[PDB]
Write a protein that binds this ligand. Structure first.
Ligand SMILES: [Mg+2]
Ligand SMILES: [Mg+2]
Ligand SMILES: [Mg+2]
Ligand SMILES: [Mg+2]
Ligand SMILES: [Mg+2]
Ligand SMILES: [Mg+2]
Ligand SMILES: [Mg+2]
Ligand SMILES: [Mg+2]
Ligand SMILES: [Mg+2]
Ligand SMILES: [Mg+2]
Ligand SMILES: [Mg+2]
Ligand SMILES: [Mg+2]
Ligand SMILES: [Mg+2]
Ligand SMILES: [Mg+2]
Ligand SMILES: [Mg+2]
Ligand SMILES: [Mg+2]
Ligand SMILES: [Mg+2]
Ligand SMILES: [Mg+2]
Ligand SMILES: [Mg+2]
Ligand SMILES: [Mg+2]
Ligand SMILES: [Mg+2]
Ligand SMILES: [Mg+2]
Ligand SMILES: [Mg+2]
Ligand SMILES: [Mg+2]
Ligand SMILES: [Mg+2]
Ligand SMILES: [Mg+2]
Ligand SMILES: [Mg+2]
Ligand SMILES: [Mg+2]
Ligand SMILES: [Mg+2]
Ligand SMILES: [Mg+2]
Ligand SMILES: [Mg+2]
Ligand SMILES: [Mg+2]
Ligand SMILES: [Mg+2]
Ligand SMILES: [Mg+2]
Ligand SMILES: [Mg+2]
Ligand SMILES: [Mg+2]
Ligand SMILES: [Mg+2]
Ligand SMILES: [Mg+2]
Ligand SMILES: [Mg+2]
Ligand SMILES: [Mg+2]
Ligand SMILES: [Mg+2]
Ligand SMILES: [Mg+2]
Ligand SMILES: [Mg+2]
Ligand SMILES: [Mg+2]
Ligand SMILES: [Mg+2]
Ligand SMILES: [Mg+2]
Ligand SMILES: [Mg+2]
Ligand SMILES: [Mg+2]
Ligand SMILES: [Mg+2]
Ligand SMILES: [Mg+2]
Ligand SMILES: [Mg+2]
Ligand SMILES: [Mg+2]
Ligand SMILES: [Mg+2]
Ligand SMILES: [Mg+2]
Ligand SMILES: [Mg+2]
Ligand SMILES: [Mg+2]
Ligand SMILES: [Mg+2]
Ligand SMILES: [Mg+2]
Lengths: 146, 124, 100, 114, 47
RNA sequence: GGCAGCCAACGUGUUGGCUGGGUAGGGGAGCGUCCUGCAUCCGGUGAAGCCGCCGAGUGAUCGAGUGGUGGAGGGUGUGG
RNA sequence: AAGUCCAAGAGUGCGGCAGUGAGACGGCGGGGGAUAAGCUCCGUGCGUCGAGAGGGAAACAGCCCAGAUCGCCGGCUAAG
RNA sequence: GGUGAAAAGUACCCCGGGAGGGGAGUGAAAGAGUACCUGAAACCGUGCGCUUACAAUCCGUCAGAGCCCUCGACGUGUCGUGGGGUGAUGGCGUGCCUUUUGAAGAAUGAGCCUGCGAGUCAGGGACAUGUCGCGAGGUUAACCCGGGUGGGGUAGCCGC
């Protein structure tokens, strides 16, 4: 029989990532991989196996192209004709954290286990964080060469 | 000779419901609603009995890729190097080792990189 | 002390004193059989070279022959009237490994 | 196990769920609180249920010689019984049926020391 | 030593009578007439 | 690893080569129920029906396999 | 003239049995249509669905890869 | 249509106005009390174990932690060629029959259960297919005599 995680065999860890001048797509993909926990060999899809990840400086996200004005973030409130339109520039001007939150929630699984993984992502705008008590390990995204 | 129908229908209907025990609503209490989704349930069993090998292999490869990236190597490179070295161990045993002995993976990745050629983009 | 053993075209991770469920092989129960080696792990070191794999052998004792749980096969196709039934039950054997 | 006594009244001319409404208010209580609640609950079903509880208390006190102050209601439940069948004329001369329902009542009393 | 017990028919002398329209396992829903038609209802004259 | 059909060799059924998705439809082999024949047998020391547990058959299933209700009839076999 | 020649279960005749004579899609050659239809009518030792299980194109019979005897918590692959 | 072996059909006491019930007794049994053998399923609950109130679902299957019960070896719970009931959570997942080229179809039918309900039947009728006896012969009907299916019956029949 293959291995599956037990009740308390699951382990967590705290990682902090700076987002200054980092590409949104790469940063968010790496974060999603970390929250799902594909970095541990004890991965199992029916139970959460990832780590808590904290991102700093959500307002310093850098994106390529002219999408600062030509990319839109959409949502509809519920009434007919209630569709409203905002850009990434306005989104970072108003709530900088929303863009990173949306990007990460878009690639996590869209099931209840996925939104349960979403429960454990901390996203802030400023350079400080009140979670220094949990001594997070700084994480820098790297690529394996082959 | 008239053969009035007491046990013949009863035996088969009871075996249908008994096999259909454990459902909700009319499902586990009612015959005409049992046989239909009884057959649906067993058809699902037939299909996912094949699907189970695929899903397990998927999870298996996922765990192996995780272990390889922890040991700083990609899944495709690890598998190609393993085939070049001529080791016939299968993903079941690799996954159990990844759960079990990182020393075993350390030795295995060392063997794989040793068997890896000089240049990966050679025309050979 | 655990090892990987080849049997019936299958591979298994078995340790000393363990009992494993493998496919049926023609052998009288209570006898001993010899099997090839795919991997052996002994504490800190491991042996993976094919030469050592062929050199090392694993001996196990056939304990009993058993039939698995009943599995029933139903091929049913909607709106066409095709309705098929079939049961199945495989013979399986249990081996207790002795020495590796 | 603890000593217990049972008493029931069948063929009572009330609806099953309509008596169960009152019956849900007496489960697990002591006999004194039960009598008080049945006296003070304005329902038609309160009368047969209170009569059954009183009869069960009388049986427990007489046949087994138990002290009423320590009796409590162990389990009480109502089950539907045979239903009287009638016909009612309705509009356009077309006819519908009336199901005259009847219910069973069961009360068992347990004596629990304080 | 033959009793009334030891009486058997010839092999193949007994052929099973076919029960038509007696379950979709063997013959179902059509009774060997196929789909709709006058042959499915009664008959056709020989001439 | 196992069942099944066709075929070849030899035998008083093993080996070997292939095939096995299928509606209408054709062919072959079976399960179960009621009622009769007989050789016989079970059953108030509990039959049938009723409600479970454990097993076994490739299937309709089977268990002279047992537990709680029931108090009066049934079964193997080969046949029809 | 060769090749499967332990069989494609190939051909032809006769005998017993019923189904069908409402097709659809796609690729080819075409008519009508406006080179319009998911249109109609043909031809196809064309293919597929009908009468087909699985993977891929998000879903999607007909397109692409590929033929489900049963089982395995085994490996190599086609389309992608 | 069925209490029972027979009415031996529940004296008496108690709750209740009665209906209804509990004991005590009858009886082998009252889980046989006249609404009476056996009493299933649809049906309506009670009590117990588990799950569920951030949750988008032809409701199941494949994995699958936890909780509860059980069986052996080993101590306070831990494994073992373990079962049981529940199942949080992930993969897949568009009921059945018809008639259709084409249906989950927003095409038809089914509220549910218990029974009832469909290739049957007669002829020296005819053909072909297995089986049985005789053989250049194969054979009978009606009918007569045996509480009995047996014996007789050459009128005809089919190929030579
Ligand atoms: Mg369930
Ligand atoms: Mg269809
Ligand atoms: Mg059919
Ligand atoms: Mg009142
Ligand atoms: Mg037609
Ligand atoms: Mg029809
Ligand atoms: Mg027809
Ligand atoms: Mg053979
Ligand atoms: Mg077939
Ligand atoms: Mg057919
Ligand atoms: Mg007796
Ligand atoms: Mg007894
Ligand atoms: Mg018995
Ligand atoms: Mg009895
Ligand atoms: Mg009988
Ligand atoms: Mg029998
Ligand atoms: Mg017979
Ligand atoms: Mg017979
Ligand atoms: Mg052949
Ligand atoms: Mg022919
Ligand atoms: Mg025919
Ligand atoms: Mg036509
Ligand atoms: Mg036509
Ligand atoms: Mg045409
Ligand atoms: Mg067309
Ligand atoms: Mg067309
Ligand atoms: Mg064209
Ligand atoms: Mg043209
Ligand atoms: Mg048309
Ligand atoms: Mg064409
Ligand atoms: Mg058709
Ligand atoms: Mg298909
Ligand atoms: Mg086909
Ligand atoms: Mg598909
Ligand atoms: Mg096949
Ligand atoms: Mg007595
Ligand atoms: Mg009654
Ligand atoms: Mg009775
Ligand atoms: Mg619950
Ligand atoms: Mg919750
Ligand atoms: Mg969704
Ligand atoms: Mg679903
Ligand atoms: Mg699903
Ligand atoms: Mg889905
Ligand atoms: Mg039907
Ligand atoms: Mg129509
Ligand atoms: Mg159709
Ligand atoms: Mg139509
Ligand atoms: Mg609808
Ligand atoms: Mg319509
Ligand atoms: Mg309609
Ligand atoms: Mg329809
Ligand atoms: Mg119509
Ligand atoms: Mg309707
Ligand atoms: Mg109605
Ligand atoms: Mg005839
Ligand atoms: Mg003949
Ligand atoms: Mg005569």
């Amino acid at each position: 029989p293959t291995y599956t995680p037990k009740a308390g065999d699951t382990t967590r860890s705290w990682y902090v990532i700076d987002a200054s001048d980092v590409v949104l797509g790469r940063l968010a993909s790496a974060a999603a991989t970390l929250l799902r926990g594909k970095h541990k060999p004890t991965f199992t899809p029916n139970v959460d196996g990832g780590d808590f990840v904290i991102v700093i400086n959500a307002d310093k996200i850098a994106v390529s192209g002219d999408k600062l004005t030509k990319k839109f973030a959409y949502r509809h409130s519920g009434y007919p004709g209630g569709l409203r339109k905002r850009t990434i520039g306005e989104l970072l001007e108003k709530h900088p954290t929303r863009v990173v939150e949306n990007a990460i929630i878009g690639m996590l699984p869209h099931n209840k286990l996925g939104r349960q993984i979403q429960k454990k992502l901390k996203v802030y705008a400023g350079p400080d964080h009140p979670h220094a008590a949990q001594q997070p390990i700084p994480f820098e995204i790297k690529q394996v060469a082959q | 000779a008239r053969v009035k129908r007491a046990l013949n229908a009863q035996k088969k209907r009871r075996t249908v419901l008994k096999a259909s025990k454990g459902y909700r609503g009319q499902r586990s209490r009612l015959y005409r609603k049992a046989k239909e989704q009884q057959l649906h349930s067993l058809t699902y069993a037939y299909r996912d009995r094949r699907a189970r090998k695929g899903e397990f292999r998927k999870l298996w490869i996922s765990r192996i890729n995780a272990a390889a990236r922890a040991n700083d190597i990609t899944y495709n490179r690890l598998i190609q190097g393993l085939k070049a070295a001529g080791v016939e161990v299968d993903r079941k045993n690799l996954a159990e080792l990844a759960v079990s002995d990182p020393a075993a993976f350390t030795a295995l990745v060392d063997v794989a990189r040793a068997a890896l050629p000089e240049d990966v983009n050679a025309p050979s | 002390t655990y090892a990987i053993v080849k049997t019936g075209g299958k591979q298994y991770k078995v340790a000393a004193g363990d009992v494993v469920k493998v496919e049926k092989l023609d052998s009288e129960p209570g006898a001993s059989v010899s099997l090839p080696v795919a991997l052996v792990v002994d504490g800190a070191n491991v042996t993976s070279k094919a030469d050592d794999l062929a050199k090392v052998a694993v001996t196990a004792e056939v304990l009993e022959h058993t039939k698995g749980p009943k599995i029933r096969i139903h091929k049913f196709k909607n709106k066409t009237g095709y309705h098929k039934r079939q049961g199945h039950r495989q013979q399986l054997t249990v081996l207790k490994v002795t020495g590796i | 196990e603890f000593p217990s006594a049972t008493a029931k009244a069948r063929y009572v001319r009330v609806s099953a769920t309509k008596a169960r409404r009152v019956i849900d208010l007496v489960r697990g209580k002591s006999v004194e609180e039960a009598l008080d609640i049945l006296r003070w609950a304005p329902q038609a079903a309160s009368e047969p249920v209170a009569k059954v509880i009183a009869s069960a208390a009388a049986n427990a006190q007489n046949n087994e010689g138990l002290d009423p102050s320590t009796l409590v209601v162990a389990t009480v439940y109502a089950d539907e019984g045979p239903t009287a069948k009638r016909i009612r004329p309705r509009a356009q001369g077309r006819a519908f049926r009336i199901r005259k329902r009847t219910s069973h009542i069961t009360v068992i009393v347990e004596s629990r020391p304080p | 030593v033959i009793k009334l017990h030891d009486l058997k028919p010839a092999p193949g002398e007994k052929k099973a009578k076919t029960r038509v329209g007696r379950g979709e396992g063997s013959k179902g829903k059509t009774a060997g007439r196929g789909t709709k038609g006058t042959k499915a209802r009664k008959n056709v004259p020989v001439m």
